[PDB]
Amino acid sequence: MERYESLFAQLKERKEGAFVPFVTLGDLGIEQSLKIIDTLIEAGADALELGIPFVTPAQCFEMLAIIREKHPTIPIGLLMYANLVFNKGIDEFYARCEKVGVDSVLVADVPVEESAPFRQAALRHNVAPIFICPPNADDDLLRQIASYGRGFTYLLSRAAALPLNHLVAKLKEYNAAPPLQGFGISAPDQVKAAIDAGAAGAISGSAIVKIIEQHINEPEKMLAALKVFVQPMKAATR
Amino acid sequence: MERYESLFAQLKERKEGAFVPFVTLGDLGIEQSLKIIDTLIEAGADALELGIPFVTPAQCFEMLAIIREKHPTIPIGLLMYANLVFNKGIDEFYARCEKVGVDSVLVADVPVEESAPFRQAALRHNVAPIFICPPNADDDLLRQIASYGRGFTYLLSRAAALPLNHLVAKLKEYNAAPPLQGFGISAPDQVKAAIDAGAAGAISGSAIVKIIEQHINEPEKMLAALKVFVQPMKAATR
Amino acid sequence: MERYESLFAQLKERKEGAFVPFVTLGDLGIEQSLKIIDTLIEAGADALELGIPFVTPAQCFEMLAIIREKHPTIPIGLLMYANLVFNKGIDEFYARCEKVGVDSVLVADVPVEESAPFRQAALRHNVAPIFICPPNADDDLLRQIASYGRGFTYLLSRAAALPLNHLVAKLKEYNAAPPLQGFGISAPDQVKAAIDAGAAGAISGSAIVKIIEQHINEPEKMLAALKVFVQPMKAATR
Amino acid sequence: MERYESLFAQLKERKEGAFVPFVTLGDLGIEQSLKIIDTLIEAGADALELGIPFVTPAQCFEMLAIIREKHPTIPIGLLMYANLVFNKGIDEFYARCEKVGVDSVLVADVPVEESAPFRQAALRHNVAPIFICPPNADDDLLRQIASYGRGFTYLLSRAAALPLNHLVAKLKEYNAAPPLQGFGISAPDQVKAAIDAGAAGAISGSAIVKIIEQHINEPEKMLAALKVFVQPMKAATR
Numbered sequence: 001m002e003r004y005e006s007l008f009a010q011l012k013e014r015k016e017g018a019f020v021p022f023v024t025l026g027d028l029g030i031e032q033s034l035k036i037i038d039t040l041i042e043a044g045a046d047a048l049e050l051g052i053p054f055v056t057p058a059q060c061f062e063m064l065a066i067i068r069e070k071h072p073t074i075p076i077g078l079l080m081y082a083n084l085v086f087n088k089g090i091d092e093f094y095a096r097c098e099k100v101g102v103d104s105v106l107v108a109d110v111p112v113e114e115s116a117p118f119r120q121a122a123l124r125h126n127v128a129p130i131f132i133c134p135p136n137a138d139d140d141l142l143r144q145i146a147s148y149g150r151g152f153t154y155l156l157s158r159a160a161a162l163p164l165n166h167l168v169a170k171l172k173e174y175n176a177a178p179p180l181q182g183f184g185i186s187a188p189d190q191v192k193a194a195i196d197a198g199a200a201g202a203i204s205g206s207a208i209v210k211i212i213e214q215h216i217n218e219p220e221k222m223l224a225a226l227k228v229f230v231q232p233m234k235a236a237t238r
Numbered sequence: 239m240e241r242y243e244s245l246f247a248q249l250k251e252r253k254e255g256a257f258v259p260f261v262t263l264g265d266l267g268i269e270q271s272l273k274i275i276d277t278l279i280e281a282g283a284d285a286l287e288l289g290i291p292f293v294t295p296a297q298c299f300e301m302l303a304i305i306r307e308k309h310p311t312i313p314i315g316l317l318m319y320a321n322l323v324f325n326k327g328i329d330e331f332y333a334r335c336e337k338v339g340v341d342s343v344l345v346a347d348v349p350v351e352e353s354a355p356f357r358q359a360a361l362r363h364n365v366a367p368i369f370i371c372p373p374n375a376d377d378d379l380l381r382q383i384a385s386y387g388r389g390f391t392y393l394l395s396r397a398a399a400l401p402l403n404h405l406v407a408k409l410k411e412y413n414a415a416p417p418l419q420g421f422g423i424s425a426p427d428q429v430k431a432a433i434d435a436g437a438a439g440a441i442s443g444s445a446i447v448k449i450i451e452q453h454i455n456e457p458e459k460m461l462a463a464l465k466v467f468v469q470p471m472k473a474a475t476r
Numbered sequence: 477m478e479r480y481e482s483l484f485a486q487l488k489e490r491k492e493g494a495f496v497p498f499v500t501l502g503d504l505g506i507e508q509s510l511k512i513i514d515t516l517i518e519a520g521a522d523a524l525e526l527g528i529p530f531v532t533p534a535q536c537f538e539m540l541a542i543i544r545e546k547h548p549t550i551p552i553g554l555l556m557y558a559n560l561v562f563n564k565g566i567d568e569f570y571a572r573c574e575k576v577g578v579d580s581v582l583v584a585d586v587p588v589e590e591s592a593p594f595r596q597a598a599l600r601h602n603v604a605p606i607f608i609c610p611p612n613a614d615d616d617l618l619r620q621i622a623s624y625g626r627g628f629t630y631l632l633s634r635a636a637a638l639p640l641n642h643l644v645a646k647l648k649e650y651n652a653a654p655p656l657q658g659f660g661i662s663a664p665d666q667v668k669a670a671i672d673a674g675a676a677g678a679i680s681g682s683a684i685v686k687i688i689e690q691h692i693n694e695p696e697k698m699l700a701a702l703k704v705f706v707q708p709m710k711a712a713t714r
Numbered sequence: 715m716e717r718y719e720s721l722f723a724q725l726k727e728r729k730e731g732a733f734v735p736f737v738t739l740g741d742l743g744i745e746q747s748l749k750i751i752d753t754l755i756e757a758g759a760d761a762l763e764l765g766i767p768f769v770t771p772a773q774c775f776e777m778l779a780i781i782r783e784k785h786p787t788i789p790i791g792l793l794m795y796a797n798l799v800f801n802k803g804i805d806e807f808y809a810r811c812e813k814v815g816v817d818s819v820l821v822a823d824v825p826v827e828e829s830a831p832f833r834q835a836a837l838r839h840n841v842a843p844i845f846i847c848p849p850n851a852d853d854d855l856l857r858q859i860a861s862y863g864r865g866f867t868y869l870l871s872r873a874a875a876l877p878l879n880h881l882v883a884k885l886k887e888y889n890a891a892p893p894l895q896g897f898g899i900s901a902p903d904q905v906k907a908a909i910d911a912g913a914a915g916a917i918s919g920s921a922i923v924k925i926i927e928q929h930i931n932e933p934e935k936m937l938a939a940l941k942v943f944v945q946p947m948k949a950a951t952r
Contacts, residue, residue, distance in 0.1 A: 187351040208352045215321045228355045300599050333651035559929045589901040590922045593942045
């Protein structure tokens with residue numbers, strides 16, 4: 001299945017960009033985590049990028065399974081570190097992702113030059129291998145990233161760096177998967193600027209979501225609190 | 239009302255910088271806390287920055303009301319964490335601040351990028367939203383901070399970092415609210431250096447004030463003890 | 477503790493207004509007075525407003541202590557005159573109120589402009605200072621009343637006067653404590669009209685309660701007599 | 715002698731405004747009245763405005779004589795109604811004021827247009843004739859009031875009205891006696907606002923002073939009670 005392919009096609013028909021929140025797992029229990037994720041989706045998230053920081057990883061996969069069960073169409077991407085993959089085998093890790101329904105995997109600490117085993121395991125298990133594209137990527141790197149990646153291309157957060165328009169223009173020229181500008185933390189105007197420069201959307205972490213995740217246990221209060229921050233981010237993609 | 243606006247205008251006419259002590263609430267009871275604050279004002283404080291650490295918060299607001307009642311002209315700024323605001327609603331929190339007479343609010347753990355709801359609630363309730371400016375703030379951040387803030391701009395404590403003169407020079411170039419160099423703990427010479435570099439003044443916490451707050455209950459003894467430390471700090475702003 | 481805060485929160489969750497009878501003390505002895513108050517509560521009163529007319533005041537405070545002991549959750553507000561407070565000291569009076577469990581104090585003959593010492597003593601002793609809001613209150617007065625009051629705002633009885641909706645709308649705009657329309661004497665339809673106009677409830681005196689207080693000594697007969705008048709008043713708040 | 719002239723010169727040298735309480739005579743006996751007035755002076759009153767409501771008037775003049783004897787420098791102004799003056803003659807009334815040492819006289823119910831006989835009797839007896847200046851006084855009235863008055867100009871309580879700054883600015887432009895904003899009842903912040911707008915000070919009546927006048931007979935208790943209210947009013951003039 002190709003959840004990213006379908007999401008991006010649906011977004012274009014609407015001249016919309018994608019807003020993808022990044023949330024790290026491991027802090028609170030399954031129930032609270034599931035509430036936060038459920039609320040972000042109801043609040044307007046087009047896709048999800050979930051991190052398993054450098055709650056056990058096994059429980060995080062049970063959470064991914066529960067999310068997939070409740071939201072069959074939303075693209076779910078995982079961001080993790082190599083040590084986790086090595087723990088029980090590369091092929092085994094990607095088999096587990098395929099099993100639970102993970103759409104993409106970004107191994108954060110693996111340089112593109114040493115990515116072959118990870119990307120091949122991904123392809124063999126119908127999981128999109130995600131690559132990070134730096135601001136100052138030369139023509140070669142861009143051709144490689146466009147060639148190896150699937151799902152979407154992760155643009156590293158800004159802060160010689162090529163202007164967003166150029167980098168995106170080139171990636172599109174080399175048939176790379178849709179570029180999503182990464183942020184870590186961002187404002188609506190920054191998301192709008194990324195999309196105006198041609199990005200397919202944005203992936204951003206957030207201090208507020210983490211604060212709400214803790215401190216707020218009521219579903220209704222959580223939804224009200226998140227809408228205040230998520231709605232303007234999604235409105236910046238239209 | 240604009241207490242900061244009037245304080246800074248009066249300080250300029252005197253070629254003086256502002257000395258703003260930062261004191262955390264929550265340790266001792268209302269009476270002792272009120273004594274310490276009363277003494278700092280009699281000792282020479284131009285404004286006050288009060289923190290509600292991460293005595294209940296409700297009692298802290300009663301204290302703020304009592305302080306405002308006794309000192310109608312002195313600017314009172316609050317420094318707190320998002321969890322407190324979320325406890326009963328963002329708008330509700332700023333409404334309560336306006337009600338008691340708080341002049342500014344600095345939500346310490348909220349990045350500028352996710353500040354929209356807090357700053358808009360501040361604006362709607364006549365409370366100045368305060369922003370923290372890091373040493374190595376790029377041109378963008380400076381334009382944003384200058385645009386969103388009111389009352390004063392909080393310069394994060396030093397310890398690539400731009401030299402104080404530059405950072406201040408730029409902020410003034412972008413119409414930002416008066417910059418106050420933050421410290422946590424400082425000496426008279428450090429305050430003087432901040433003002434000589436163009437800062438409108440300094441905000442500093444202190445180990446001595448906390449030691450006096452505890453251990454000394456006599457108003458006369460407290461005043462004598464504080465003057466020894468406060469007078470030289472204020473003398474450094476002239 | 478915040479009995480008013482909790483009462484109003486519970487009433488909203490039920491889309492109900494508050495019915496608060498006002499009863500003057502001083503006529504009959506402790507036992508009969510306690511019976512009347514006990515019956516009004518059993519009959520449906522959400523809170524109580526007790527007056528110490530312009531039985532000694534000391535006995536009235538013993539009664540307040542006995543009422544608080546028997547009804548730990550019901551808000552108890554006192555309405556009295558300045559001469560009483562001055563008799564043994566402002567701070568001393570509010571200390572005594574806090575001691576017995578009084579939730580609010582309304583000093584009827586003190587204008588808002590000369591209220592500073594009374595409201596500050598209230599704040600220092602965890603007692604809500606109540607202010608009277610006239611029908612034709614200008615924007616200033618409304619801002620001041622909203623700023624100084626706590627617990628609830630007392631709307632002076634009607635009989636240029638601003639229409640109830642407006643006055644309430646503004647008070648809510650300035651974060652004032654929940655407005656209760658005062659009456660002295662009222663009918664169910666009048667209470668309903670006050671709540672439909674946005675008031676949080678009504679405070680009303682009554683000729684019937686006083687007649688029952690005298691003439692009826694039997695607890696069963698008293699309860700039956702009061703229910704006839706109280707139930708419809710409370711039904712008007714739903 | 716010119717007690718107002720000297721008071722205002724002394725206040726300017728100190729950058730201070732004047733606080734003038736207004737107290738009506740006629741309620742209690744000479745001794746109690748004298749105690750209240752003595753306490754207001756010890757509490758901080760810069761001048762006194764005494765009213766003889768619309769104790770006989772003859773006794774009130776004996777009181778004025780006793781006050782003058784005990785406080786030789788404090789300006790004493792009288793506020794009364796025409797009927798009193800007519801009772802035994804205009805010239806005779808002002809002769810009596812001069813005799814006892816009254817510094818100024820404000821005949822409340824006499825319009826400026828019919829003031830000639832009163833103001834001329836005042837001038838002939840070295841008594842300052844006081845005039846009331848309304849909020850919406852045209853340029854003519856202002857020129858007349860500035861021309862006929864002495865001692866100070868009484869600004870009628872607010873509640874098209876010209877903003878305080880303007881009215882004061884004009885009066886100063888026409889050489890009028892120092893303007894004092896009248897109130898009837900006021901808070902410290904209102905006094906401060908009047909002075910910040912340029913007024914030479916404020917004259918205010920008070921519900922609290924009347925309550926203390928009755929109910930409190932002990933000099934020590936009276937002084938303590940009044941200081942609580944007078945000190946903040948006088949602090950608002952500095």
